[PDB]
Design goal:
homodimer; 265 residues; Helix Hairpins; 7-stranded mixed sheet; 3-stranded antiparallel sheet; elongated; binds phosphoaminophosphonic acid-adenylate ester; binds magnesium ion; ligase (chains A, B); aminoacyl-trna synthetase (chains A, B); cytoplasm (chains A, B)
């Protein structure tokens, strides 16, 4: 009955899944049981559904927003560095240090707002009020934390421009959206140096989203001058909460986890 | 009846769609008709389907491969630069000049094979023969051309490892796949300095895919030592052929086109 070492405990925690029936037994026997369960999990997925959780959640979210009147956007991932400055991200500011630069000209987008802003302006010349669009896709930020942050993550951003752009409607859409996914939340006032007063959608201490009721003074910089509402959510945070993963690495695009199951068996 | 200038003709060609009923009339009246048609196209999309073509094609392809027994993978977009060297991409070779480097350590993947190779090895410890997986996602290459090449594009890669890994089965899957999408093709032998003998799937002069029947000597470098087959396809090329777009910029993740309709109206 010698106690487990910390490294042994870390190995088992890699193989552990939240719903597992979790002492006395030696490491090798516990590792062997969990290896066996996890192989069985992968087999069941391969035999039956075959869908990746992140891809699937993206499809479910897409269905939700298309059915509620929002146009699906697929915009570039590499964007001009200008777009960041025009977002008023001064080089002093924390999010400046977080940008992945690629060329002299471009970066990997740290957020979806810049492209959606351009779509709102452009679509305003063609579509009837209100204009409703959303995008889901990769975003990139350099981060220090690893429990709730990834450097490569997936963001949903939805927005509406014209009539109906109230706090009430925004909260109502957020509420329907998270009640549809079956994720608990509360809405709290917060701020940030780019957008002023946000609503943050929180699960305990974890920020699922930052949302905003416009207008804001930077709007003019995108040729926007109508009311608008918008919110951005992290898909990997949503998965982490929905599947009760202890670490966000389980929800990521990854070579070490598949639907939260270690691939190192 | 003065002739159209080349710049005027370029403006109209931006607004023209392949199915349009295409003289005599002045520029302003032709531009106005086409503006009107294109606004109507966007309105119809917004009123009815609301789906982006590239997102939609990704869903349809996903359905096709999941239904035929392939596991859906979502792996990282930023990958180690090592992975490129281990692919045997010597710095001399053309694809070396095409890599978008990000850090000292990482690049934007120019292809999906490296990650899929790792999944095949890892999954072999858990799944029954044959192992079938696919991934669809962003890939990046610096290119000179702009008619058939983008720097940011979307790749499908499917592969099978173990039994059933023959040329015949690979051609059969390619055939079913493209007959399901309704895209004409022929299969031609070609080569490349990384994989030896490929099959290239061609539409006229346009390469839709490069596919390979293994094994190959580099396999060992990924811990793979079984037969395998695989192919990689460009979604934007598939869309370009399917919708008969003259330029691949119409099929891309973009701020200038939405489902091949100019957004500059
Ligand atoms: N590094 C990251 N990894 C995973 N998800 C993220 C990351 N950054 C942002 N998100 C998600 O994207 C949503 C909107 O982005 P944003 O509000 O700008 O992030 P944020 O306010 O910096 N949150 P945090 O960094 O946790 O304090 C957040 O609510 C998160 O759910
Ligand atoms: N720059 C690009 N833009 C769009 N699609 C691409 C690009 N590069 C590759 N593809 C697609 O990805 C598939 C597999 O990649 P690969 O065969 O390595 O490209 P390739 O052989 O360099 N083709 P090409 O560059 O046109 O001669 C190709 O058949 C194309 O359909
Ligand atoms: Mg942050
Ligand atoms: Mg926030
Ligand atoms: Mg090429
Ligand atoms: Mg090729």
């Amino acid at each position: 009955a010698p106690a487990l070492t910390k490294s042994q405990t870390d190995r088992l925690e890699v193989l552990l899944n939240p719903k597992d029936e979790i002492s006395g037994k030696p490491f090798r026997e516990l590792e062997s049981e969990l290896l066996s369960r996890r192989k069985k999990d992968l087999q069941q997925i391969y035999a039956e559904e075959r869908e990746n959780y992140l891809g699937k959640l993206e499809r479910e979210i897409t269905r939700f927003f298309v059915d509620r009147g929002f146009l699906e956007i697929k915009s570039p991932i590499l964007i001009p560095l200008e777009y960041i400055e025009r977002m008023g991200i001064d080089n002093d500011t924390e999010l400046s240090k977080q940008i992945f630069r690629v060329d002299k000209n471009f970066c990997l987008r740290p957020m979806l707002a810049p492209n959606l802003g351009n779509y709102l302006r452009k679509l305003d010349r063609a579509l009837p009020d209100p204009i409703k669009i959303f995008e889901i896709g990769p975003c990139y930020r350099k981060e220090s934390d690893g429990k709730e942050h990834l450097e490569e993550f997936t963001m949903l951003n939805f927005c509406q421009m014209g009539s109906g752009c109230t706090r009430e409607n925004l909260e109502s859409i957020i509420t329907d959206f998270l009640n549809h996914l079956g994720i608990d939340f509360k809405i709290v006032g917060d701020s940030c140096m780019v957008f002023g007063d946000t609503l943050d959608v929180m699960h305990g201490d974890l920020e699922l989203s930052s949302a905003v009721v416009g207008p804001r003074p930077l709007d003019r910089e995108w040729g926007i001058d109508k009311p608008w509402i918008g919110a951005g959510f992290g898909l990997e945070r949503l998965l982490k909460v929905k599947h009760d993963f202890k670490n966000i690495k389980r929800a990521a695009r990854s070579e070490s986890y598949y639907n939260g199951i270690s691939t190192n068996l």
